[PDB]
Symmetry: C3
Subunit: 327 residues, 3 copies
């Protein structure tokens, strides 16, 4: 019967359409490159106020080179004019009653204990230590640079897909509403402006500057390079996203936030040495570049095609058995 080949042919057509849409969707005809070779250069603009002193970019940004990971310092704890000597440490966990409990077996990873149980103050007696005296007092409260909210991070980024040798940057003037310098990134109003506001990146991360600034944190400015290299070059476009990477699990057991120490090293006119020890809290920024590019290639196209052919060839036989048996 000719209805055998009309039923057949119709069968073939419908099944072929399903399969074809599925494969063409996922671009299974494409080899993919996922090893994006990115380079990132950043610049911070702004000046803040702290105590009775002004902080400029050289004061609160570290490292100064503009690497993919940098810190804006928002709050700091100063221990000025330390000198090598012996002094009672200030952290309660060094508490003692006798010099018997200041031996080497106590806090083995801690400081260098001299062995003397000495009176730090009238209310607390701690083991004495040799090292930078006086010891740090990391249990006070200090101001935070509010002006950090109005600082700007300018993110130059140049990427290359090496499989296809396709290199492009995120400085796209034909894709920004405003001139390069005047523009600021809004995920909707200007998604390709490379100048981000610190408070913005804080808010897209969905976190509060006051709290973050105080305790420190790690924000990720993610640069994504999903591209179809079958398509025109003007279509390989970077999409920015924002997240808080020091995300706070409910369990905790470790102090959240971000802080690190470093010293400004001075030497006396006398000759002896003395430093200013700084415990710094601020927002670390991690520009995380992702990308993946697809291109037509003879081998994945052939493999995808053969897969389609055979899959339909079986689909019509099983559809014939299900139809003929009618259940």
């Amino acid at each position: 019967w000719t209805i055998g080949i009309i039923n057949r042919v119709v069968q073939l057509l419908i099944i072929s359409y399903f399969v074809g849409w599925v494969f063409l969707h996922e671009k299974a005809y494409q080899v993919r490159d996922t090893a994006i070779e990115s380079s990132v250069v950043t610049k911070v603009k702004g000046s803040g106020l702290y105590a009775n002193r002004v902080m400029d970019v050289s004061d609160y940004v570290t490292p100064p080179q503009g690497t993919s990971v940098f810190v804006i310092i928002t709050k700091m704890i100063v221990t000025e004019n330390q000198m090598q000597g012996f002094c009672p440490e200030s952290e309660e966990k060094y508490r003692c009653v006798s010099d018997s409990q200041c031996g080497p077996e106590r806090l083995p990873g801690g400081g260098i204990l001299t062995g003397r149980c000495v009176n730090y103050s009238s209310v607390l007696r701690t083991c004495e230590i040799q090292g930078w005296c006086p010891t740090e007092v990391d249990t006070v409260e200090t101001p935070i640079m509010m002006e950090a909210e109005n600082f700007t991070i300018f993110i130059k980024n140049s990427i290359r897909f090496p499989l296809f040798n396709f290199e492009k940057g995120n400085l796209l003037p034909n894709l920004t509403a405003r001139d390069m310098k005047t523009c600021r990134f809004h995920p909707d109003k200007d998604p390709f402006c490379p100048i981000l506001r610190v408070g913005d990146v804080v808010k897209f991360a969905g976190q509060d500057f006051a709290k973050l600034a105080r305790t420190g944190g790690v924000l990720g400015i993610k640069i994504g390079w999903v591209c179809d290299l079958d398509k025109a070059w003007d279509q390989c476009i970077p999409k920015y996203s924002f997240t808080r990477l020091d995300s706070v699990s409910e369990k905790s057991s470790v102090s959240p936030g971000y802080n690190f120490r470093f010293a400004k090293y001075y030497k006396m006119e006398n000759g002896s040495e003395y430093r200013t020890l700084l415990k710094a809290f601020g927002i670390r920024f991690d520009v995380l570049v992702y990308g993946n590019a697809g291109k037509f290639n003879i081998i994945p196209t052939i493999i995808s095609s053969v897969a389609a052919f055979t899959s339909v060839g079986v689909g019509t036989v099983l559809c014939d058995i299900i139809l003929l048996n009618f259940l």
Copy 2:
């Protein structure tokens, strides 16, 4: 007719050859690892002259650890002995006529404005600012360290393909014409010597040292690790390439080059604090490691094979219809 199976068999053979060469070419029988786990350690050698002072590696290289991204400083702008205070800023964009136009709404991302319109000089009246005084004057011209051309970057690089747990380095003495220390990288005369000359990397990048040095720039020393792990180990060889990553698009709207500030922090015998503010221009180097390794594996070999079988099985039927119909 036996000519049916001679025509058939010949058909089969030719088509099979085409397909086989295509698949064997792309090594479709291989699973590929593209997540190269690289570690890079660099060392700069050389000394330059600047003003009436000598710069050695500790003076002009930053950071000193030898990371994958480091800067050779070729020109710098010194603002010596800054102190916290009030002074007219020097940048014309702060110009004012009355203190009415030095309110907070002016240059909100700029410095900390005191509110006074003051006479910086007799020809320019700018808003006064609180901060490091005197302000910077970033519109002058200074010399550049020419000797930077004769500096050398020694690039130790150790990579590992984790899918295959295949780790190798780029220090290959059996692959260099000269002893390790005496050798210098030439893309032809010695493509595996890990000691590169700064001016060389500048020239392979195709850019002029004088200009670059003056304005700063970002060069990429790309280490490529394309390897067939089916093949012998002696064949996993690194290939170096060189490119300028701060490439200059015609549109511009942002100053090209590379510069960053940082301060040397001093404290008076009196007690007050004072810094030397340095605006640094130089060549940043970005060692960008790429690699991808192939290996035979049962699954991609089976999939590739099945693809070949079916593709020929259809190719001979369609060749039979085209031949039989003769058009």
Copy 3:
């Protein structure tokens, strides 16, 4: 004969089992993501002794931010109070007999030669140089901070597979025997504790602290994220490994170990400038994050399936020919 379809059917079943186990093993039904987007933050705890001075984290860790690559300084060579001037260099390779052999053509990549052959000491006459005087003497022996063995590296790591948008961290309290702070990483007794002991990482690397400390070295703390995202989330677990990346090939020709210089910059009450030049040896740590995630996906499942179907369809025909011919 019904034995034709019993032999057939049995054939089909056995071959189908072989193929099915092979494909299901390699999870060929999965698309794989190998572009792990990781962020690493590290903290060092401990204090060491060096000469008659104490070193704390700000003194011996660099950079202080806690990046994926940081150095614990174990031994250092101090050249105190350098000043710009002219002096005979101390390295024997500058040896001369007359000022004729101190011209510009000698050691062109070396220092700035003045041109005078001068008597450094009574036993050695070297070319004079302009630069930081006195010159460095990098041929002496100094102590090493032994307490570095009892220091701890705490490795916070947050990863994201962007293809599947699957983000997880290595801080897993339900996976550690001990509270987060008290725990220490043992590859068996606690493989998910993020606090590693320096001497531990040295020993898992299989190297001796005394020797390493003295000469410097590069250790890699590898964080591996092999995960089946078909499987439950609690199964995406990080596995740590440890290796020495400045591995010593037998050929050598370059000094092993790890060292870098940097200067502490001071200025006189007089006004002139003078630095302390430090040649630092220590253990650099490279947290190298790898990961690869698999997930079921319609396209690789279809391709794998079709491959299986056709492979069995041919396997039974060739098994029929081998059986029928009986050899």
